[PDB]
From a paper:
Peptidyl arginine deiminase 6 ([name] or [name]) is a poorly understood member of the PADI family that is crucial for early embryo development in mice and humans. Canonical members of the PADI family catalyse the post-translational conversion of peptidyl arginine residues to citrulline in a process known as citrullination. However, [name] does not yet have a confirmed catalytic function, with its classification as an arginine deiminase based on sequence conservation and genomic co-localisation with the other PADI family members. The molecular mechanisms surrounding the function of [name] are poorly understood, however a growing body of evidence supports a structural role for [name] in early embryo development.
To investigate how the lack of conservation in the [name] sequence impacts its structure, and to gain insight into the molecular function of [name], we determined the crystal structure of hPADI6 at a resolution of 2.44 Å. Like hPADI2 and hPADI4, hPADI6 crystallised as a head-to-tail homodimer. hPADI6 possessed a similar domain architecture to hPADI2 and hPADI4, with two N-terminal IgG sub-domains from residues 1–121 and 122–303 respectively, and a C-terminal α/β-propeller domain from residues 304–694. As for hPADI2 and hPADI4, the hPADI6 dimer is formed through contacts between the C-terminal α/β-propeller domain of one monomer and the N-terminal IgG subdomain 1 of the second. Ca1 is coordinated in hPADI4 by two glutamic acid residues initially, followed by a glutamine residue upon Ca2 binding (E353, E411, Q349). Only the asparagine is not conserved in hPADI6 where it is replaced by an alanine (A382). The aspartic acids (D359, D482) and histidine (H480) are conserved in hPADI6, and structurally align with the equivalent residues in the Ca2+-bound forms of hPADI2 and hPADI4. The catalytic cysteine of hPADIs 1 to 4 is not conserved in hPADI6 but is replaced by an alanine flanked by two cysteine residues. C675 is still far from the active site centre however and would need to move approximately 9.1 Å to be in a similar position to the catalytic cysteine of Ca2+-bound holo-hPADI4. By contrast, hPADI6 is well ordered in this region and a loop (E670–D673, blocking loop) blocks the entrance to the active site cleft, occupying the site bound by BAEE in substrate-bound hPADI4.
Residue numbers in the entry:
A (entry chain A): 7 to 63, 71 to 165, 177 to 382, 390 to 694
B (entry chain B): 8 to 63, 72 to 165, 179 to 694
Write the structure that this text describes.
Amino acid sequence: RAMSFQSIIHLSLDSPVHAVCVLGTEICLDLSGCAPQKCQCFTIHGSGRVLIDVANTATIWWPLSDPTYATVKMTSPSPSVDADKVSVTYYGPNEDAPVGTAVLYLTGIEVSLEVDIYRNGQVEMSSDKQAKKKWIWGPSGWGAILLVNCNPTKKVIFSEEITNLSQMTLNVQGPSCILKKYRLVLHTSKEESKKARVYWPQKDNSSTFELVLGPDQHAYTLALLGNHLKETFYVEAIAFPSAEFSGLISYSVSLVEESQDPSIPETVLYKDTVVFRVAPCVFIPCTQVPLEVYLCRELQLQGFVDTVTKLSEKSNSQVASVYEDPNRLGRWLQDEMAFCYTQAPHKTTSLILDTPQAMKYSLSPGIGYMIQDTEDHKVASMDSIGNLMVSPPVKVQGKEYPLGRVLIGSSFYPSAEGRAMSKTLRDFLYAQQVQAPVELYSDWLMTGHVDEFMCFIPTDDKNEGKKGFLLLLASPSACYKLFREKQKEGYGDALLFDELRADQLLSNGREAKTIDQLLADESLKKQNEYVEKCIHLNRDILKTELGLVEQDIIEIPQLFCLEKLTNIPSDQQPKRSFARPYFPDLLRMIVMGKNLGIPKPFGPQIKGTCCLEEKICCLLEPLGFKCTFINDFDCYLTEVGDICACANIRRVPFAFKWWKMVP
Amino acid sequence: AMSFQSIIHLSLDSPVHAVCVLGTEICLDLSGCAPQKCQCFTIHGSGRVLIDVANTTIWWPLSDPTYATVKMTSPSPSVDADKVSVTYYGPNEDAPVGTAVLYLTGIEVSLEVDIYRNGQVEMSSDKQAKKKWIWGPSGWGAILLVNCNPKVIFSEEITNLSQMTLNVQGPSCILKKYRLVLHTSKEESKKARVYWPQKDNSSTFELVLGPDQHAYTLALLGNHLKETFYVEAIAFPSAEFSGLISYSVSLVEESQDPSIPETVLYKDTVVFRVAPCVFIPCTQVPLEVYLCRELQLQGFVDTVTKLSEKSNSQVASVYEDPNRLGRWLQDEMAFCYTQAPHKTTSLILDTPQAADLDEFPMKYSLSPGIGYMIQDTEDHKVASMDSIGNLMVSPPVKVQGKEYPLGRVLIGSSFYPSAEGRAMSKTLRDFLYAQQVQAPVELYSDWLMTGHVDEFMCFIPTDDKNEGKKGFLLLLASPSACYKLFREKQKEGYGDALLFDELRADQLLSNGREAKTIDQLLADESLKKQNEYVEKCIHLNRDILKTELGLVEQDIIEIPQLFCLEKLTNIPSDQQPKRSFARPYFPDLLRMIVMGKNLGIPKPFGPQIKGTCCLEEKICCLLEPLGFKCTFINDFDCYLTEVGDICACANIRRVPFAFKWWKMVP
């Protein structure tokens, strides 16, 4: 018989050995095992396609130690059986006549599954048949990547725009009479198979593809017929990383020899394996350049819609009209949806991650869609993708976060009526690994949204090598100080909510008051002292987990007031009070480069000018920002569940490749 | 009062009053209240204040963003007991233009554990590094042991749990205003238990945190508060549990005013890692040989016991389990260990295949101090491979640099999606991979009836570690080697030598074997075709083992061994697989009991030459020169029993690795 597909071949003097070898495999030859006793040296010959590596511990005679091992490899497929050969000639002590000779006849067979492991936009061969089985993060790492299909049976037509999925090439090569003996099996674990789909084009250039592997088929058989098989398969991921799926999927090809005796089972001779990582879902901070501006113009194409639309024009950003959904709560375009992206070397896909807390959504061409499951569905439930803010890229005590860090609001401690993100959604976020999430304390808010006490704005200081962002933070203490400063100047008669109409103040549950009155409202100060404490707790957290300094923080005067949650049934109405903005929150701004669309506060007016608007411009306009105040008081004070003119902005995906990070 | 503020804004008109939690940095904006004319300042503080003027009689220059962080070293004795004064100066004016004052009160609120793994709780200077668990010799992070013992009172012998100390200090007029809340996430709470010894009787303990309590309130009254808590894990790492559990103490001030809610001022968090379940290879020294003597002490148990005494190892009798299939002690249980700096716990991991209703009684009374832990499984058939008996630990190895100081778990499975393939269930496989410290290796054993790799491979401990070598040897079955040996014997004229010579008629007939001469064996075409198939399977594993354990041919020794292919008949015929599986033809020489250099090898009853087995002679020629002392076990019935039938089995408890698992980098 032939010593085929064996890691070690025992050489023989009487008769030669014949073996069939899969390309890339190392065969160890025990040269000293069959060496006569007299021998003390040998000479080794080989054909061209054979690579001989003698181990440690013109004719060239090498010493025959005990043991003496030499590993043989085959570089290219054999053109015919036994078309390569190795000969070991043993020599006795001082005779010059060869004592004996051992002969090996090799046939080289190629069976390789190859993918784009070097992330150069093409399927590249991997010489290291062991390294191709690993997926390593970092600039020195490697590993093919797989994109989740974000487009909303046994055969499917994929057009050329969608055929930008990952590529996996199966190459089989060798003498026909050898290849005919075996069959191939492309397979993966059943768990893995339920996490991606493999399609095979039925004919070259055919838009028609057959699902060879998928959730219902973890094994696909291929018949070898002596030709030099060359087939490209197309894989697509079906789900982002999750708590039970690290994102790694392996595919293998196994060589099988059907049995010639029914009693004897069939035999397995070789297996090659490749690895894909499912690219994670990456969220984009507001410091990134705006590209599109989606507005849920809820029959209110004026005020917010008109000014926001104008703002995007100033910032060179497109506007897309979103259609209101009757089955969804108000402000669903931002509280229940988020712009994100998932990247691979061959294609970048931007999409909406939707977290229905309650299906018709029409995006600009090329923008994907994906639904993430939620568990809590309250009106003020903090278990929505809206309870999330992405910090700009930062560097905390060495460790880099080039894609920023997701920030999620929860209850700092197990409060009696605390609220927080569900396990399902939090687990989804933590599994992406590339924007290490940070827990913030926003349970004191009624909405739970951190955009009501903080907001990031882009600076061009990175030209000088600076951080390139600023953190704006609500500070009731700064507003009280400003109002007290105006009082010292004699402007205590100035009135908050001055240029506002009674049908708006009364419907929005606010009443106008002078600087002297607010600075005398004792309950209002106790409430704003409570909020000031909450904000400083988040200030200490943010400075820690984002590596911020006080030079990065700009306090913005902002007042709040504590009110019960009344937009839900009384049976589930929390007894405690939650914070709501007293006047339109200045930190809920629309950031578009240096153009800032800030909500108009309607603060006390001095010489016909809002003192809050004047102070905000004094703070930011010297930094190069263009404040543009949006006059819609009804929209900015709308209830938690009521309908408002919503807005959500698509932004440029990070230029940094997420796979070059080291989580 | 700017109590617990990250930044304090100074003022020349009035001083600031603040409470500072020990270990926290308060940033001071000196330039904010600096008079415009000023170009320099002087900063003084009290002994307990640490002032770090950091930014990009002594006068320091006053830059535009002049910032300084103040820290407190020890708790304040009384409110405002410590002060910092910044005096600002104008240009060419000896008179100080102004002064700002801050009053600091230092409060300690620290939750501390043994993060440096020296068996004692240690204060953590870095309040943010203690939240991290870092692997490796330069890492840190406290460790937790699972409870493997088969209000609550716990004796001192069982009081070897992990310790978590809570310390609070500071003036009482301040502490009395707040309360503590020791808590953990709801999910984490369901992974461990925290007990607090009552101040009355130390032997009695109260469950402050557990699977039904993720928050526990303590009222802060006195100047000083110190309480020690004892933590135990309840389950090893799994697919739904990385092994990290954190506990935090939050400082809460109650709100007298009904309209305003309570306020959170500070939180200290510590992190524990649950120590994984580590399996031991047979190259480690034996301590106890457990034997399930199924009402038969003649061949197997009698020999094993004598080998155990010869090897300086105790012997422990195992009560036979009437509700479990035979060989359960070997096939359904494994001796593991979980290690912590304070304590190492050896235990038995049982994967009961015997059924979902395998019931109320677990008749295993191990030696004192030996734990017990059940791992659930999915497949419970007779020839199933979904059990901890389908597991072999490799010796410590190095593969392309990456080290495996605890060895590598090896699991049998179907290499490819066979038509009737078998493997470990997801549940068991996930449990094993979750341990991370013995990174599993998938091997091909679906071709054997039992699925056990012990029937084709065995590790034996060499003492060449004194010579800086690997310290083990890999014995591998070789049907080809056995044929070559038999052919040599035929060539010498011994073709008449008879396999199974010294065995009686009742033995062969009951164990389904027929004596044959060497001439007959070498003639049996089906036997050659059956062992050629087994040769192909083993050679595939040989490549896997060399790659994933960094082995060379010098590490491998071929042991002559023959097999045969048979249909699984020990089960109902309606569930009988169509295919054939390999079984040892004559007693498997590799299913040996390894105790140091004393090797208990099954007696093969091979062809005899001059009244001596040639298989025993070959085995001794191979291994005795390497220092091993072979001792053949004569029990033909035991080593040829069917899959489900009763056997005299053994399971040896061995020394846990010396290497501390937490010092490796998976």
